[PDB]
Amino acid sequence: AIDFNDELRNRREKLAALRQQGVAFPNDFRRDHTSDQLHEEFDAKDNQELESLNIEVSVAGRMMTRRIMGKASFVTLQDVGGRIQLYVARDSLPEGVYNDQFKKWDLGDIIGARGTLFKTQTGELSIHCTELRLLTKALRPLPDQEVRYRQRYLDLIANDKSRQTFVVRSKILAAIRQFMVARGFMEVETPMMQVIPGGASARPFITHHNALDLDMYLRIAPELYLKRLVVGGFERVFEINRNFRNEGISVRHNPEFTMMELYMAYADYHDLIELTESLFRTLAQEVLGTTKVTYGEHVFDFGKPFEKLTMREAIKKYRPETDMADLDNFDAAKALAESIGITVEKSWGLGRIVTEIFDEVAEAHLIQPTFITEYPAEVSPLARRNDVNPEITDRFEFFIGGREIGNGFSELNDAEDQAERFQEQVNAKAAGDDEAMFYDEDYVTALEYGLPPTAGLGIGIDRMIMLFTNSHTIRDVILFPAMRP
Amino acid sequence: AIDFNDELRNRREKLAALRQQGVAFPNDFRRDHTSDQLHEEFDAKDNQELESLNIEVSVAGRMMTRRIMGKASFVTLQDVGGRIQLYVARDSLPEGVYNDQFKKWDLGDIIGARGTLFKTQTGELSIHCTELRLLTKALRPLPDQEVRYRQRYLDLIANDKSRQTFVVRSKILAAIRQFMVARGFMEVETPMMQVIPGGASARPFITHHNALDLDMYLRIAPELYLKRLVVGGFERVFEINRNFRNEGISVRHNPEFTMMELYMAYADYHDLIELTESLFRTLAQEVLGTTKVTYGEHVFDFGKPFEKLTMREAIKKYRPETDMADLDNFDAAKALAESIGITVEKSWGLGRIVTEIFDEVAEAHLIQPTFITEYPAEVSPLARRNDVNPEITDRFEFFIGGREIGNGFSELNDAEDQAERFQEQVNAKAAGDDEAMFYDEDYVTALEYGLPPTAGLGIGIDRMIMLFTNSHTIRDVILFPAMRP
Ligand SMILES: Nc1ncnc2c1ncn2[C@@H]1O[C@H](COP(=O)(O)OP(=O)(O)CP(=O)(O)O)[C@@H](O)[C@H]1O
Ligand SMILES: Nc1ncnc2c1ncn2[C@@H]1O[C@H](COP(=O)(O)OP(=O)(O)CP(=O)(O)O)[C@@H](O)[C@H]1O
Ligand SMILES: N[C@@H](CCCC[NH3+])C(=O)O
Numbered sequence: 017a018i019d020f021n022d023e024l025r026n027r028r029e030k031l032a033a034l035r036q037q038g039v040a041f042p043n044d045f046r047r048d049h050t051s052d053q054l055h056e057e058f059d060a061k062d063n064q065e066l067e068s069l070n071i072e073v074s075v076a077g078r079m080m081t082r083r084i085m086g087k088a089s090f091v092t093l094q095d096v097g098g099r100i101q102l103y104v105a106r107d108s109l110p111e112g113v114y115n116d117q118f119k120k121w122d123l124g125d126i127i128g129a130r131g132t133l134f135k136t137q138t139g140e141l142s143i144h145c146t147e148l149r150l151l152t153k154a155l156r157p158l159p160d161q162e163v164r165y166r167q168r169y170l171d172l173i174a175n176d177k178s179r180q181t182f183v184v185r186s187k188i189l190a191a192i193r194q195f196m197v198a199r200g201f202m203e204v205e206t207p208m209m210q211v212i213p214g215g216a217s218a219r220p221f222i223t224h225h226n227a228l229d230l231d232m233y234l235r236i237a238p239e240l241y242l243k244r245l246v247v248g249g250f251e252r253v254f255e256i257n258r259n260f261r262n263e264g265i266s267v268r269h270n271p272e273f274t275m276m277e278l279y280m281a282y283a284d285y286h287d288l289i290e291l292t293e294s295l296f297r298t299l300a301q302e303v304l305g306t307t308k309v310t311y312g313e314h315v316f317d318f319g320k321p322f323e324k325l326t327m328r329e330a331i332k333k334y335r336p337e338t339d340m341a342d343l344d345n346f347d348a349a350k351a352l353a354e355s356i357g358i359t360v361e362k363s364w365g366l367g368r369i370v371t372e373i374f375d376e377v378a379e380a381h382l383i384q385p386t387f388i389t390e391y392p393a394e395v396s397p398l399a400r401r402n403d404v405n406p407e408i409t410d411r412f413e414f415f416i417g418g419r420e421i422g423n424g425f426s427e428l429n430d431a432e433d434q435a436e437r438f439q440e441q442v443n444a445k446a447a448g449d450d451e452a453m454f455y456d457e458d459y460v461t462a463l464e465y466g467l468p469p470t471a472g473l474g475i476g477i478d479r480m481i482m483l484f485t486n487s488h489t490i491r492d493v494i495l496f497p498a499m500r501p
Numbered sequence: 502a503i504d505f506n507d508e509l510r511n512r513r514e515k516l517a518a519l520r521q522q523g524v525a526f527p528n529d530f531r532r533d534h535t536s537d538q539l540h541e542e543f544d545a546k547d548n549q550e551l552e553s554l555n556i557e558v559s560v561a562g563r564m565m566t567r568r569i570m571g572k573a574s575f576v577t578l579q580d581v582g583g584r585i586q587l588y589v590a591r592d593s594l595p596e597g598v599y600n601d602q603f604k605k606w607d608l609g610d611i612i613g614a615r616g617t618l619f620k621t622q623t624g625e626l627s628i629h630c631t632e633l634r635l636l637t638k639a640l641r642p643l644p645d646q647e648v649r650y651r652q653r654y655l656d657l658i659a660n661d662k663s664r665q666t667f668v669v670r671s672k673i674l675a676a677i678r679q680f681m682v683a684r685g686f687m688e689v690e691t692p693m694m695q696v697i698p699g700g701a702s703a704r705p706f707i708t709h710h711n712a713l714d715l716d717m718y719l720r721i722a723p724e725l726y727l728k729r730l731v732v733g734g735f736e737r738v739f740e741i742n743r744n745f746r747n748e749g750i751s752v753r754h755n756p757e758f759t760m761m762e763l764y765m766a767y768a769d770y771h772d773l774i775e776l777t778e779s780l781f782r783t784l785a786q787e788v789l790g791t792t793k794v795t796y797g798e799h800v801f802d803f804g805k806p807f808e809k810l811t812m813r814e815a816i817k818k819y820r821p822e823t824d825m826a827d828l829d830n831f832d833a834a835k836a837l838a839e840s841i842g843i844t845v846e847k848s849w850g851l852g853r854i855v856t857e858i859f860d861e862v863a864e865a866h867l868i869q870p871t872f873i874t875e876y877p878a879e880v881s882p883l884a885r886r887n888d889v890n891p892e893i894t895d896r897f898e899f900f901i902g903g904r905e906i907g908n909g910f911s912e913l914n915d916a917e918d919q920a921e922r923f924q925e926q927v928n929a930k931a932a933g934d935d936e937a938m939f940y941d942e943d944y945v946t947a948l949e950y951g952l953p954p955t956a957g958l959g960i961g962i963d964r965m966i967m968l969f970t971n972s973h974t975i976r977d978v979i980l981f982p983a984m985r986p
C-alpha cells in the first residue's frame with residue numbers, strides 16, 4: 017500500500033544523491049555481448065573449458081533479481097537477448113563499489129557489467145564481475161489486461177511471452193519479404209494520404225492539408241496505386257504497410273492495421289491460392305520449425321492444402337436448413353437475411369445480401385485454413401468478372417481460426433467495365449452506402465493505357481501473426497493497440 | 502491533333518470487335534521468363550550455341566515498337582525486366598494469327614509470346630515466335646514535368662531512367678534492412694495515429710475517430726513509441742515508415758515522407774556517426790558498385806569520413822563577417838537573425854534564434870557529407886544534455902547536397918528533465934509556438950521505469966534516395982508525390 021510510495025520516495029532520494037555526485041545519467045558504458053549470444057556460444061562448455069578460455073565479456077541490462085549474501089551476490093540481468101547471471105563479489109570489484117554502490121542499487125536499475133565467464137555449481141552460465149556500473153536509475157519498481165496495452169513497456173519487461181510474440185512478428189515480416197523477393201517481387205511505397213480513397217469499402221479517416229486548403233483521406237487500401245504501377249511496368253510489386261479504417265475496435269479489428277498487398281501480372285487467382293499456401297507453409301516451417309501449428313484448441317497443418325468452398329457452399333454447410341433457392345431471389349434473400357439479424361439497407365442488392373448472410377452464417381466456423389470463392393460482383397467492384405457468370409467474380413477470401421485473413425482476386429483490367437462499376441458504387445453511395453467507393457477518373461485512364469492480366473492479394477498481417485503466436489486478440493500482436501479513451 | 506482522337510476511336514472499335522469474338526480480356530497466358538533473365542543468361546551465347554540448345558521460352562509485356570516487313574516483323578516487348586525482341590513470322594504462327602490478329606494490334610497492347618531463342622544478324626537476342634497472343638488491348642496510344650507525377654504510370658512506361666530510379670530505391674531499402682538486421686536491429690511497427698503527437702516539431706494532420714468520438718493526429722515521428730520499446734527491452738530497434746507533416750510542398754518536402762528511426766542502447770551519438778558513415782559507404786558500394794557518387798556537379802566519396810562542424814563553426818564559416826559574440830546575446834542575435842530575413846517569434850530564445858540563423862546561413866552550403874553538432878537544448882527537447890554545457894545537447898544533424906538528411910542524438914533518459922522540457926514546450930505553445938510539443942505523461946512514466954543510455958537516429962529516406970539516383974527534387978524519388986489541386 018504505502019510501501020509503494022516508500023519505494024518511489026527512496027528511488028527519487030537515491031537519484032538526488034546521484035546528481036550531487038556527478039552525472040546521474042551517463043552514456044559511456046559499452047557492452048560487447050548480449051545474453052543470448054553468451055548462451056548460444058558457452059552453454060555447452062563445462063567450467064574446466066571456460067576456466068582455460070578465460071573469456072572476458074561486457075554486458076548491460078535491467079537488474080531483474082538479486083540475492084545478496086554478505087560479501088557476494090547473484091544477480092539476474094535482463095537484456096534484449098534474455099537473461100544472464102552475474103556473480104558480484106566485494107573483492108572482485110574496485111574498492112567500495114560493492115558496498116558503497118552496488119548494494120544501494122534497486123531492482124529495475126539498468127546496469128553494466130564486465131567480467132569473466134564461468135559456470136555455477138548449478139551449471140548456469142554466469143559472469144564473474146570485475147567491473148560493475150549503474151547506468152540508469154529506475155525511479156519506479158519493476159512491474160485488467162488493458163494495462164498491458166496501456167503500458168506495453170511494462171508488459172514487455174515483465175512477460176517473456178509478450179516479448180517473444182513481438183520477436184516472432186518481426187521474424188515473420190522478414191521472412192515474408194525474403195519470400196516475396198525470392199519470387200521476383202519488388203517492394204514499393206504508395207501514398208497513405210489520398211484525395212480519393214479507394215481499393216476497398218470502409219468509412220475513412222478524413223484530414224485537412226493546410227498548405228493546399230484541401231481535404232485528404234487516410235488510405236483504406238493501396239490497391240488503386242499498386243495497379244497503376246503494374247500498368248507502368250512493375251509487374252511483380254508488393255507493399256507492406258498500414259491501412260486506416262474509421263471503424264470500431266474489436267478482437268480482430270484495430271482502426272489502423274498492417275496489410276500486405278501484392279500483384280503479379282500474367283497470373284490469376286489460382287496462382288494466388290498456391291502462393292498463399294506456399295507462404296504459410298514456409299512461414300510455419302521457417303519460423304516455427306514445423307508445419308503443424310497449435311492455435312487454441314486446434315492444430316493447423318500448413319503442410320496440407322487449404323479447404324476450398326464457394327460462398328454458397330459455405331452458407332449451406334453451416335446453415336444446412338437453408339433453402340438455397342432463397343439466395344437466387346431478392347425478396348426471399350432479404351427475408352432470410354433479416355431473419356438472422358442482418359439489417360438490409362436499401363442500396364443492397366442480391367449479391368450484397370448473400371455476402372452478408374455468408375458473413376453471419378459461415379465465417380466464424382471456418383477454423384481450418386479455407387478459401388471461399390465466387391464473391392458476387394456487387395461487392396467486388398475491382399475484381400475480374402467470371403467468364404461464365406458475370407454476376408460473380410474471380411475473387412476469394414481465405415479464413416483461418418474463424419477470421420478473414422486474406423482477400424485476393426484476378427484483377428479487373430477492363431476500363432469500361434471498371435468505370436461502370438465505379439458508377440454503380442457512386443449511385444449506391446448516393447443511395448445511402450456510406451462505405452461505397454469514389455469514382456476515380458485517373459484510375460480508369462490508367463486502365464485505358466492497359467493493365468496486363470493480373471492477380472492481387474491482400475493479407476491482414478496482424479491477423480496472420482495471431483495464428484503464429486497463438487494470440488486470440490489482435491491487441492496481443494500490435495505493440496500499441498488503439499486504446500479507448 | 503485529330504489523329505489522336507482517331508487513335509482513340511480505332512482502339513475502342515477494335516475492342517468492340519474483341520468483345521464480339523469472346524472474352525476481350527483473358528487471364529490465361531503464363532510466361533516463364535522476363536527479358537532481363539533471358540539477357541543475363543543468353544546475351545553471351547552465339548547463334549550456333551543457341552541453335553543447338555534450342556531453348557523455348559514464354560514472355561509477356563507491352564508492345565513498344567514494331568516493324569512489319571510483309572510476311573515477317575520485328576517487335577520490341579517491354580516487361581518488368583526491360584526489353585526483348587520478337588521475330589514474328591506468318592509461317593511460324595498458327596494459320597491466320599499473323600494476318601488476322603497480329604497485324605491488327607497496336608503499340609501499347611499487352612502481348613504474350615512463346616518461341617525459340619536465337620540472335621539476329623544484328624547480334625541481338627530475339628525470340629522466334631511459335632505462339633503470339635493479345636492479352637490486353639490498350640485503348641490509349643503509348644505516351645510540364647508535373648505530368649510525370651500526375652500519371653506516373655506513363656512516366657514509368659516511357660522513361661527507362663524513371664523506372665531505374667525506383668528500382669534503386671527498392672534496392673536501397675532492402676540493403677538498409679539487411680544492413681540493420683546484420684547489426685542485430687529488429688524492425689518494429691508503432692502507431693501512425695496518435696492521441697498526443699510528438700518526437701518532433703511540426704504542424705500535424707488532425708483527424709477524427711468516430712467510434713471513440715476522439716480527435717486523433719497523424720504521427721509526425723515514431724520517436725516516443727520507439728524509446729518506450731527500448732525501456733521494454735528491445736534495445737536495438739528501428740522502423741522505416743511514413744511521417745506526416747502538415748507543411749507545404751517543396752523540392753525537398755512532401756507532406757508525407759518515409760523515415761527510418763533506429764535506437765541502440767548503450768551507445769551515444771558518436772556511435773550514430775560511425776553507423777551513418779558505414780551505412781552510406783555500404784549502400785554506395787553495394788548498390789552503385791562504387792563509393793564515389795556523382796550528384797549534379799559534385800562527387801561524394803562515401804569512402805571518406807564526413808566533415809564535422811559545430812553549429813556555430815558552420816555559421817562562422819558560411820557568413821565570416823558575423824561577429825560570433827552576437828550569438829551569445831539575445832538582443833544582438835535577434836537583430837542578426839532579423840537582418841537576414843528571419844521573423845523572430847516571441848516564444849523564441851537564444852538557442853532557437855541561433856538554430857534559425859544556421860538554417861538560413863549555412864545549411865545550403867553543406868554540399869559534401871557533413872555532421873553539424875552542438876544543437877541547442879531549446880530546440881532539442883528529447884536529446885541528452887551536454888555534460889559541460891547544459892544549454893546544448895549531444896545532438897547532430899547531417900547534410901549532403903545542401904539538404905538535411907538525418908537527425909540523431911544521445912537520447913534523454915532523465916525523466917525529471919524530460920518533464921521540465923515538456924513543460925517548457927507547453928509554455929511555448931501557449932506563447933504562440935504552434936509547432937511546440939505536447940506534454941506526454943505516459944512517456945515520462947516510461948522514463949521513470951528506466952531507459953538505458955541510448956542513441957537514436959532519424960534519416961529521411963526520400964532525401965537519401967535523391968543522393969543515390971542523382972535526383973534534384975524529392976518528387977523524382979516518390980512514386981506518387983503530393984500534387985497541388
Ligand atoms: N480493422 C481491421 N483490423 C485488422 N485487420 C483488418 C481490419 N479490416 C480489415 N482487415 C484485414 O484486411 C483484409 C482485407 O480487407 P477487407 O476489406 O477484406 O476487410 P474486411 O472488412 O472484410 C475484414 P472483417 O470481415 O473481419 O471485418 C481482411 O481480410 C483482414 O485481414
Ligand atoms: N516534409 C519533409 N519531406 C521529406 N523529408 C522530410 C520532411 N521533413 C523532414 N524530413 C526528413 O526528416 C528528417 C528529420 O526530421 P526533422 O524534424 O529534422 O525535419 P526538418 O524540418 O529539420 C527538415 P528541413 O530542415 O529540410 O525542413 C529530416 O532530416 C529530413 O531528412
Ligand atoms: N485492397 C483489398 C486487398 C487486395 C485485393 C486484391 N486486389 C482490400 O483492402 O480488401
Ligand SMILES: N[C@@H](CCCC[NH3+])C(=O)O
Nearest residue numbers: 700701722724957958959
Ligand atoms: N524523431 C526525430 C528523428 C530521430 C531523432 C533521434 N532520437 C525527428 O523527427 O527529427
Ligand SMILES: [Mg+2]
Nearest residue numbers: 218261263269
Ligand atoms: Mg470490416
Ligand SMILES: [Mg+2]
Nearest residue numbers: 375379413420
Ligand atoms: Mg469481410
Ligand SMILES: [Mg+2]
Nearest residue numbers: 413420422423
Ligand atoms: Mg472483405
Ligand SMILES: [Mg+2]
Nearest residue numbers: 703746748754
Ligand atoms: Mg520542416
Ligand SMILES: [Mg+2]
Nearest residue numbers: 860864898905
Ligand atoms: Mg531543419
Ligand SMILES: [Mg+2]
Nearest residue numbers: 898905907908
Ligand atoms: Mg531538424
